[PDB]
Amino acid sequence: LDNNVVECIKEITESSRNGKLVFFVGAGVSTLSDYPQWWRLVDKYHEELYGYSSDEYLRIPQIFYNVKGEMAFDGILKDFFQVDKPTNPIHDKILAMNPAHVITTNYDNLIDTACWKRGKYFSVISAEEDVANATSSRYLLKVAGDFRKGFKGENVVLKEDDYLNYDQNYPLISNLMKTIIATHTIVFIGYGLGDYNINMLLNWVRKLQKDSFHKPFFIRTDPSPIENETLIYYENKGLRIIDAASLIDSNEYDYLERYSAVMDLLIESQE
Amino acid sequence: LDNNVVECIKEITESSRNGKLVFFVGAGVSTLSDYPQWWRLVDKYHEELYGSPYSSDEYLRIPQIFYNVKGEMAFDGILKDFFQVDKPTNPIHDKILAMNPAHVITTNYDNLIDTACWKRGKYFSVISAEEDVANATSSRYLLKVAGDFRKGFKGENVVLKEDDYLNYDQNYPLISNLMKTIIATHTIVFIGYGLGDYNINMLLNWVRKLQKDSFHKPFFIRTDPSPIENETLIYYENKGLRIIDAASLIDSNEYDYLERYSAVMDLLIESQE
Amino acid sequence: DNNVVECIKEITESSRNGKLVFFVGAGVSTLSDYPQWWRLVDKYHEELYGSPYSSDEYLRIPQIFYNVKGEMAFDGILKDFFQVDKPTNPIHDKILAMNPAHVITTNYDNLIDTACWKRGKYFSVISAEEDVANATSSRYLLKVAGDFRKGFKGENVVLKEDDYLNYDQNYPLISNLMKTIIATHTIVFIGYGLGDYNINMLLNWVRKLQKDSFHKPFFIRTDPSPIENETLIYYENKGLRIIDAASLIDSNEYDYLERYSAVMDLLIESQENKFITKDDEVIDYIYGKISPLFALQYIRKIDLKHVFE
Amino acid sequence: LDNNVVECIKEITESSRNGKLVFFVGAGVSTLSDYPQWWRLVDKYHEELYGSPKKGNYSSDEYLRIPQIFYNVKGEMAFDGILKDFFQVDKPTNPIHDKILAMNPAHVITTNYDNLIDTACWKRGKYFSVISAEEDVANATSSRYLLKVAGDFRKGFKGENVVLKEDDYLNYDQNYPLISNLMKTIIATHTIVFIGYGLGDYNINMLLNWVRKLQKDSFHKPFFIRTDPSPIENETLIYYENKGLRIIDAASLIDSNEYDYLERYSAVMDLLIESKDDEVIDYIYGKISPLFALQYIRKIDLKHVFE
Ligand SMILES: NC(=O)c1ccc[n+]([C@@H]2O[C@H](COP(=O)([O-])OP(=O)(O)OC[C@H]3O[C@@H](n4cnc5c(N)ncnc54)[C@H](O)[C@@H]3O)[C@@H](O)[C@H]2O)c1
Ligand SMILES: NC(=O)c1ccc[n+]([C@@H]2O[C@H](COP(=O)([O-])OP(=O)(O)OC[C@H]3O[C@@H](n4cnc5c(N)ncnc54)[C@H](O)[C@@H]3O)[C@@H](O)[C@H]2O)c1
Ligand SMILES: NC(=O)c1ccc[n+]([C@@H]2O[C@H](COP(=O)([O-])OP(=O)(O)OC[C@H]3O[C@@H](n4cnc5c(N)ncnc54)[C@H](O)[C@@H]3O)[C@@H](O)[C@H]2O)c1
Ligand SMILES: NC(=O)c1ccc[n+]([C@@H]2O[C@H](COP(=O)([O-])OP(=O)(O)OC[C@H]3O[C@@H](n4cnc5c(N)ncnc54)[C@H](O)[C@@H]3O)[C@@H](O)[C@H]2O)c1
């Protein structure tokens, strides 16, 4: 173990005990259930266009929409995202932490089904109107939309145009997410350090005063242990990183093992 | 109060019982209990710069002009001498607290609502400064969007000058986000606020940015003597505001402001709890 | 005094080089007896509440009327006031006599355009978004508050609250052009109130600029009473150089053309040799004019007339 | 040649003859002079940081961040030292710079921090006021600007007076308010022709995003000279042509080799710089029609009319 790791685990458990822990779950948690990873859809759109760079993830969907209409866009999106994948152990592991809120950029319903299975009831907030009608005290925030109003591309923010207008298209959802981040303890699971959402959140946290907020915990479970340079870089940007690969030596492709190891370490520390 | 008022009271009481009620207490309420209204301070500031003495832009500029010209020290001096006189909490404060509001949002810097909250036994975690937002110890917040003098009687703690309002969104990101979230997720009742108030109008613009029927239109208690002109009422109602007119509610003289406030407060409290 | 003398010197030096831009306010239009805004605001208030301000009220009352009585009523009430024509006053002639590089005006009238046509200098007028892209001439008459050229509707002009709220979004090209002209050219404000909405917005934008990276605009104040010193410091530290017409000449408050005429006569008449009285400044001026000619072996005697203008 | 390129050339030459042509010179023109490509700088930064060069290509986010990570991790001094090592060299100006200058553009907008464009302008005896810093906008020394929107190395080879890292681009609108607004004004009031830029470039993406906010059919679509190795796809062409661009594909016209960029640039450039008994009467009438407004015309003035 490590003194930094033990301190982070203790802080996480302490915040979970008093109901302050909030889980920011990325696509890494949803790929455990073998849900279509975004590069699958990007590659399908690219192949449709002409028979992965980060900017391409937003460009390819954008060009495909602009050319093949909302018609082809929603057609492909519904085709690839109607699988009904089963929830992985990590979903229930996240739920066992008893998080106050679960912010997920994912559009798949794995997380809410996991909450229902555990019995925890989270008011799902994935649309502008959902904020006003949120009855439950605990919010499950889908800050990228979800396929519960249908399988149209308007529901989600997959393409680059939605990302560009997200601030003015999701003012209530955006400000609620910022409030949750500011007033809670945030743990990032299933997110790459280069993710668009992670970088945008890090840019936002710059505007905050030096000691105004709490540095969110980042749980990295990529196969390759991070370089010291990246750890130092993202430590000064407000991210507190716990490296699954560094914590335990494991197989490169055994992402499930890394996620589960970090999660059971947290749970066992919480008792 | 046939329809446009009875329905407002019914919705307010329903939200209060549900617990999704928040009060945006204006400066006027803190003036019901004798207190220095900001126009008096603006007059004093102008008299310091000039011989004798108001537009809202002048409201923001005259203290700003004093701060720029005279300096931080003198500005803080008049601020402290004028705003350091303790005052007794009026019946309006405990009347507001009796509704059991979830949170209390106010643009006042005085300790006249926290005192009422403590005296009534209800604990609201006061959030007046930037750093107080994250280190919150209670579910319910008494958010002073304009700051307060708890840390000290310096003018930097509060936003009252033109520059303070110019950089408010940059100066108070967390506080502004928290207030916006509270407004969006709770039913908001505005009390002791000028219909053309600066803070009210900025929030009205923010709500205009919001999409159609994506939020609940806040309530606004209007307490100055003159009954609301129909055109102004229509304009503000279409601006996402539901106006409860204290002047139309009862019959009273212009200068008896306590009676006009109490009419609305009692009609809201006693009527179906 | 030295301050006003230096202000006039800078203004004239910028004008002679073609780097002078004039920010014409509503006072210049009022000098031509054009209907001031407060008249129309009073008309709107009377129509709204039956029987009849501030920066907020000026924007609100027209805004209230727009959505309470409708677009057509707003357009009709504003056209019945602004459709009347007026003759350009001597102040427009004085403004154009400086050969300004550009004229930026928030007025919705055509008096400045008519004066530009009179003088013979073709100022391509930009009062709409499409105007910026297709403006053949290099001299811009920027109507930053719209114009009635297209029609007499209220949409073409910026005079109501929502119009000002979405100005940056509604007029991106026009705002960018005005800011570029302000940053590049020397700016003189005439016909504007010190506590004005447009001037305050320009000051707010200038605050964002890096220190000493821009030139402080000149503001010609024609208010009836001499400006308070405290306000003078406040506005000169905000990025303004104030030339007070009331201070230069004492005139009765009711009349305003005399103050504008005094300021503009000081501008036009002023010459670099007008201020040189010390015999140590005579040599300074002569050397400033003759020094670059030292690089030439011989200078034609008759050609020297060009050196001394 | 094709008809679309014919229309584009017609409009570009017309605008240039009116003194309304501006050239947005990209990094490809500088690379034509064998100037250190930014990808090589990013590779050096990555090698210094992680001890080995990155496997594969670099994304735009990588270009923006690897320099930023090195700057805040390895310190400012090393960040400027790498820039001094790679950029302090002086490279000859390629024929493309002189070709661009031969069009006598009203202004020259370039994100390059090198002085190659300035050297070409002087070699052609052109007086361009180089506005590379914030203070330069107010004190312009000439009518036509060589506006370097990404800064330049005139005031030393420090990385502060350049837009290279992620923070420089993030705070550009606040770091360069005057320069950004002047560039936008020049774009709005002039005819812009892009050279040496890729469709995936960050600067072009930002400019296209800004052009979104403009009013419908308010601005003029800027021309974009595309000279990437491969021919332009029919999907990206439509995508970027309704995004405000006027793409002119070099590979589409010239059936040239790959990695032979110089001639590919030159084809478009010299197709740009090289410019019946029923049209003769039309031309003469076009020249003489305004003269009908005058009672009498001097014959020598007629010589004047016919250039
Ligand atoms: N990025 C691409 O376009 C691309 C193309 C081919 C393969 N990949 C694969 O994706 C990974 C990196 O990029 P990405 O955006 O697709 O993922 P990422 O690593 O960028 O994605 C986010 C999260 O994904 C998790 N993850 C990645 N692969 C996983 C797996 N097999 N099982 C469980 N979790 C997994 C990591 O936990 C990471 O935090 C690499 O593992 C790579 O082999 C990516
Ligand atoms: N110099 C001035 O601006 C001026 C002119 C006339 C009256 N006043 C006094 O200032 C306020 C004028 O109305 P106003 O809306 O500008 O107020 P205000 O806007 O200055 O602030 C107070 C708000 O609270 C309520 N309020 C009004 N008068 C009050 C009073 N005397 N005691 C307690 N609460 C009051 C009103 O709803 C008012 O909007 C009153 O207090 C009035 O007696 C001031
Ligand atoms: N304050 C009001 O809203 C209101 C209402 C009715 C009438 N008025 C009259 O108008 C004047 C205020 O004018 P404003 O709204 O333009 O604010 P203003 O007085 O601030 O505008 C000032 C610019 O307009 C100029 N100006 C004022 N009167 C002028 C005149 N007769 N001729 C030429 N220029 C003049 C001054 O030049 C000044 O620099 C008041 O002093 C009053 O006489 C004002
Ligand atoms: N991603 C990388 O950095 C990487 C790695 C290895 C090789 N390369 C090669 O280096 C090139 C650098 O371009 P970029 O990817 O940095 O942007 P890019 O290739 O999109 O930029 C190309 C634009 O710049 C110009 N350009 C590119 N390469 C040129 C060349 N070799 N000669 C003349 N002009 C050229 C072209 O006009 C083109 O439109 C790549 O296009 C590729 O050929 C790049």
The DSSP result for chain C, as a single string, is -HHHHHHHHHHHHHHHTT-EEEEE-HHHHHHTT---HHHHHHHHHHHHHS----HHHHHHHHHHHHHHH-HHHHHHHHHHHHSS--PPPHHHHHHHHT--SEEEE---SSHHHHHHHHHT---EEE-SHHHHHS--SS-EEEETTB-SSS-SSSTTB--SHHHHHTHHHH-HHHHHHHHHHHHHSEEEEES--TT-HHHHHHHHHHHHSPTTSSPPPEEEE--SSPPPHHHHHHHHTTT-EEEEHHHHS---TT--HHHHHHHHHHHHH--TTTS--SHHHHHHHHHHHHGGGGGSS---TTTHHHHT-
Pair B73, B66: CB distance under 8 Å: no
Q: Which of B22, B171, B185, B216 to mutate to test the interface with A (most CBs of A within 10 A)?
A: B185
Return the number of other C-beta atoms located less than 10 Å from residue D261's C-beta.
21
Alpha-carbon distances of C132 from C123, D187, D189, D219, rounded to whole Å? 13, 11, 6, 8
Tokens of B152: 């000290």
DSSP 8-class letter at D159: S
Tokens of D139: 């004190």
How many angstroms separate the CA atoms of C78 and D170, rounded? 44
What lies within 8 Å, CB to CB, of B156 at 6+ separation is none
Beta strands (DSSP E) in A45-122 are 101-104
Alpha-carbon distances of D149 from A268, C190, D138, D139, rounded to whole Å? 55, 34, 15, 16
Alpha-carbon distances of D25 from A132, D40, D93, rounded to whole Å? 50, 20, 13
State the number of CA atoms in the 13 A half-sphere of D75 facing the CB: 3
How many angstroms separate the CA atoms of A93 and A221, rounded? 15
Q: Which residues of A touch B209 (CB under 8 A)?
A: 168, 171
Query: Is the Cα dihedral C218, C221, C226, C230 positive or negative?
Result: negative
Tokens of D178: 């005057």
CB neighbour class for C296 (10 Å; exposed up to 12, middle 13-18, buried from 19): exposed
Atom index in ligand 4 nearest the CA of residue D58 equals: 1
If we measure between CA atoms, which residue out of B259, B192, B218 comes closest to residue B38? B192
Per-residue HEC secondary structure of chain B comes to CCCCCHHHHHHHHHHHHHCCEEEEECHHHHHHCCCCCHHHHHHHHHHHHCCCCCCHHHHHHHHHHHHHHCCHHHHHHHHHHHHCCCCCCCHHHHHHHHCCCCEEEECCCCCCCHHHHHHCCCCCEEECCCCCCCCCCCCCEEEECCCCCCCCCCCCCCCCCHHHHHCHHHHCHHHHHHHHHHHHHCEEEEECCCCCCHHHHHHHHHHHHCCCCCCCCCEEEECCCCCCCHHHHHHHHHCCCEEEEHHHHCCCCCCCHHHHHHHHHHHHHHCCC
Name residues 81-100 of chain D within 8 A of A (Cβ): none
Closest CB to C215: pick one of D138, D174, D184: D138
Tokens of D274: 């090289």
- Of all protein residues, the one whose alpha carbon is nearest to atom 20 of ligand 3 is C193
Q: Is A55 in contact with D242 (Cβ distance < 8 A)?
A: no
How many angstroms separate the CA atoms of D236 and A97, rounded? 47
**Amino acid sitting at position B263:** A
Rg (CA), chain B: 18
If we measure between CA atoms, which residue out of B9, B24, B74, B73 comes closest to residue B180? B24
D50 touches A: beta carbon within 8 Å: yes
At D110 the three-state DSSP class reads strand
Pair C267, C98: CB distance under 8 Å: yes
Pair A177, A7: CB distance under 8 Å: no
Backbone gaps in chain B, preceding residues (C–N over 2.5 A): 53
- Of all protein residues, the one whose alpha carbon is nearest to atom 26 of ligand 3 is C27
Residue ranges of chain B whose CB lies within 8 Å of a chain A CB: 130-131, 133-134, 136, 170, 173-174, 177-178, 180-181, 184-185, 209-211, 213-216
Q: Which residues of D touch A203 (CB under 8 A)?
A: 170
D238 touches A: beta carbon within 8 Å: yes
How many angstroms separate the CA atoms of B131 and B136, rounded? 9
Pair D42, D70: CB distance under 8 Å: no
Per the DSSP assignment, residues forming a β-bridge with C263 are none
> Angle D5-D8-D9 (CA atoms, 0-180°, nearest 5)?
85
A29 lines ligand 1 (CB under 6 A): no
Name residues 158-187 of chain D within 8 A of C (Cβ): 174, 177-178, 181-182, 184-185
How many angstroms separate the CA atoms of C45 and B180, rounded? 33
Pair C193, C25: CB distance under 8 Å: yes
Dump the DSSP string for C113-177: HHHHHHHT---EEE-SHHHHHS--SS-EEEETTB-SSS-SSSTTB--SHHHHHTHHHH-HHHHHH
Phi (first) and psi of residue A211, to 5 degrees: -110, 20
Query: Is the Cα dihedral C79, C81, C85, C88 positive or negative?
Result: negative
A252 Cα–ligand 1 center, Å? 11
Pair D222, D187: CB distance under 8 Å: yes
How many angstroms separate the CA atoms of B155 and B77, rounded? 9
D49 touches A: beta carbon within 8 Å: yes
Pair B100, B16: CB distance under 8 Å: yes
If we measure between CA atoms, which residue out of A59, A32, A24 comes closest to residue A197? A24
C184 touches D: beta carbon within 8 Å: yes
Name residues 59-98 of chain A within 8 A of D (Cβ): 59, 62-63, 66-67
As a whole number of Å, the end-to-end CA separation of chain A is 17
Closest CB to C233: pick one of B61, B69, B205: B69
Q: Is C234 in contact with B229 (Cβ distance < 8 A)?
A: no
B167 touches C: beta carbon within 8 Å: no
How many angstroms separate the CA atoms of C125 and C140, rounded? 6
- Of all protein residues, the one whose alpha carbon is nearest to atom 1 of ligand 4 is D57
D178 touches A: beta carbon within 8 Å: no
B163 Cα–ligand 2 center, Å? 24
A120 Cα–ligand 1 center, Å? 30
Q: Which residues of A touch B213 (CB under 8 A)?
A: 129
Is B in contact with A (3 or more beta carbon pairs below 8 Å)? yes
- Of all protein residues, the one whose alpha carbon is nearest to atom 3 of ligand 3 is C53
D295 touches C: beta carbon within 8 Å: no
Query: Is the Cα dihedral C234, C235, C236, C242 positive or negative?
Result: negative
Query: Is the Cα dihedral A153, A159, A160, A166 positive or negative?
Result: positive
Distance in Å, alpha carbon of D117 to nearest chain C alpha carbon: 23
Distance in Å, alpha carbon of C209 to nearest chain D alpha carbon: 7
How many angstroms separate the CA atoms of D131 and D108, rounded? 10
Closest CB to C54: pick one of B49, B55, B232: B55
DSSP 8-class letter at D167: H
Phi (first) and psi of residue C23, to 5 degrees: -95, 95
- CB contacts < 8 Å between A and D, how many? 43
How many angstroms separate the CA atoms of D206 and C168, rounded? 18
